[PDB]
Design goal:
mainly alpha; Recoverin, domain 1; 2 domains; two-stranded antiparallel ribbon; elongated; ubl conjugation pathway; DCN1-like protein 1; cullin family protein binding; ubiquitin-like protein binding; cytoplasm
């Protein structure tokens, strides 16, 4: 599509035609009337299967718009409520949540920097995870610098299965020692 290529030219980095830079990504979110660091834009990145935050290639832009059947920003803007609704399924939420870890991190680095894991947890789990604030505090206190993928996924498991009063928690080996330690820390504070 020529209408899609013309819309791409509006964003491409002047130095590198095959990528969209900071300015171009900022332009794209503005045209969509969205904050570049908002949950709606993260949902859009998920639908575009974007590899990394603050990076948006010609391949990702072209393939994503084609897959979504969009050749204009208005067509993409209209698809946003459908993208949001798709998350109602727990299978699709787990999909978006796991995508988030890979998108947030640096390519070629195993874990997710804690400061970025907190920011993305606050973006995807705020209002979903009851102990989000205490969890972020616990990890900062135990001077954790990096979050492995296993920790990222185990937190969604904890979040979805834990009672608001933590009465259904079994510390008898079932969960790793990190989560046994978090329950020990959080129980007096609730």
């Amino acid at each position: 599509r020529k209408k899609l290529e013309q819309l791409y030219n509006r964003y491409k980095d002047p130095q590198d035609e095959n990528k969209i830079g900071i300015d171009g990504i900022q332009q794209f979110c503005d045209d969509l009337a969205l904050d570049p660091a908002s949950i709606s834009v993260l949902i859009i990145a998920w639908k575009f299967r974007a590899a990394t935050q603050c990076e948006f290639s010609k391949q990702e832009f072209m393939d994503g718009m084609t897959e979504l059947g969009c050749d204009s920003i208005e067509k993409l803007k209209a698809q946003i409520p459908k993208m949001e609704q798709e998350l109602k399924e727990p299978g699709r939420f787990k999909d978006f949540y796991q995508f988030t870890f890979n998108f947030a991190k640096n390519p070629g680095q195993k874990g997710l920097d804690l400061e970025m894991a907190i920011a993305y947890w606050n973006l995807v789990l705020n209002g979903r995870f009851k102990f989000l604030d205490l969890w972020n505090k616990f990890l900062l206190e135990h001077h954790k610098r990096s979050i492995p993928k296993d920790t990222w996924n185990l937190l969604l498991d904890f979040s979805t299965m834990i009672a608001d009063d933590m009465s259904n928690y079994d510390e008898e080996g079932a969960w790793p020692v990190l989560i046994d330690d978090f329950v020990e820390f959080a129980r007096p504070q609730i």
